[PDB]
Amino acid sequence: TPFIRPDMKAFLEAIAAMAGPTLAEMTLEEARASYVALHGMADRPARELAVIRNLSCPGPAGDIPLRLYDARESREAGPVITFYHGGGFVIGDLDTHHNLCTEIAALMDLPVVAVDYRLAPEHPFPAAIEDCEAATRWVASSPSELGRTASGVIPIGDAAGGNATIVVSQLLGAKPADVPVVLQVPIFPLASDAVGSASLEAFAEGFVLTKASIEFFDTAYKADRADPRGFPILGDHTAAPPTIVATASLDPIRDSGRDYAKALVEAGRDVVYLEMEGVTHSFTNIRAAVPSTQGDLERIIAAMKMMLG
């Protein structure tokens, strides 16, 4: 029996008791709606912020919707956080990760820009990546419409968003935006293919994210397993920016995040590796249902502050 916190185990028991249907079983509208409902019920409420503003920027296939969060209406030049939500590149949007974005903006006292990237299966790989990249470049250019000047960007994201974080840092590393990536924060990222990993076999069912969902997401997104924009473990780590990798000890894709932090050490890159003990995948968005997960996010915040100086 792997270690599980009591608060985390009750939540898994409640999900099992509630016994909802799989992503395969639901329409795309219902599956998307169930993800909204899960974070709506499970996450702490949104922080009150001076700024919660819809924006958009030009993208390779039309405008990309954005949402700006800032505890301040007016601020000095500084790093800007560019956030990419999880959901296998199929589900989630600006609302599923809204409260988490308000928490990051409140606790860091930095602006956060969340990206409403194109979703599969309607828009398969590499749509999401291209929009995450374009939106990050746009923020990094300190456009008038952002309302604050960016000295640097901080890519951050959960799960598929952690994948996007790593891919965007690699793309801006090869072709710089107007300011550097000063820190990346991949949270339970997919970096290496989870297929064949010990974590995926150990946590395949009953740990919030399932092997069933992972196969559902894989079929929708259609990323080539040889493409570094799909599986960024395959990219060049020799100039990776300062990194914080956070994983969960019960995550089926835990070993994917281990793999990435090991590759950064192997390449001589600075990295904070935090493996949250006795919690699952999604821990950043279940901070009311599993209250100890607020402490986990706060450890990531403390690491981010240290790594920015």
Binding site for ligand NPO (CB under 6 A): 23, 35, 38, 86-89, 159-160, 163, 190, 194, 208-209, 213-214, 217-218, 221, 223, 230, 253, 281-282
Cα first-last separation, the chain:
40
Rg (CA), the chain: 18
- 268 near ligand CCCCCC(=O)O, rule: CB under 6 A: yes
Name the strand (E) or helix (H) holding 114. Answer: strand 112-115
Q: What six digits make up the tokens of 86?
A: 């999880």
Between 202 and 204, whose beta carbon lies closer to its own copies? Answer: 202
| Residues numbered 271-290 forming contacts with its own copies, rule: CB under 8 A | 271-275, 288-289
Q: What six digits make up the tokens of 77?
A: 């030049």
Smallest distance from its own copies to CB 18, Å: 3
Binding-site partner at residue 303 among ligand CCCCCC(=O)O, ligand NPO, its own copies, none, CB < 5 to 8 Å by type: its own copies
Q: What six digits make up the tokens of 61?
A: 């296939």
| Residues numbered 192-211 forming contacts with ligand CCCCCC(=O)O, rule: CB under 6 A | 198-199, 202
Residues of 74-86 as b/e, b for ≥16 C-beta within 10 angstroms? ebeebbbbbbbbb
Between 209 and 240, whose beta carbon lies closer to ligand NPO? Answer: 209
State the sign of the Cα–Cα–Cα–Cα dihedral 222, 267, 270, 249. positive
Between 26 and 202, whose beta carbon lies closer to ligand CCCCCC(=O)O? Answer: 202
Q: What six digits make up the tokens of 154?
A: 């901080």
Report the distance separating Cα 105 and Cα 107, nearest Å.
6
SS3 52: strand
| Residues numbered 20-59 forming contacts with its own copies, rule: CB under 8 A | 20-21, 26-27, 29-30, 32-34, 36-46
Binding-site partner at residue 198 among ligand CCCCCC(=O)O, ligand NPO, its own copies, none, CB < 5 to 8 Å by type: ligand CCCCCC(=O)O
**Binding residues for ligand CCCCCC(=O)O (CB under 6 A):** 198-199, 202, 268
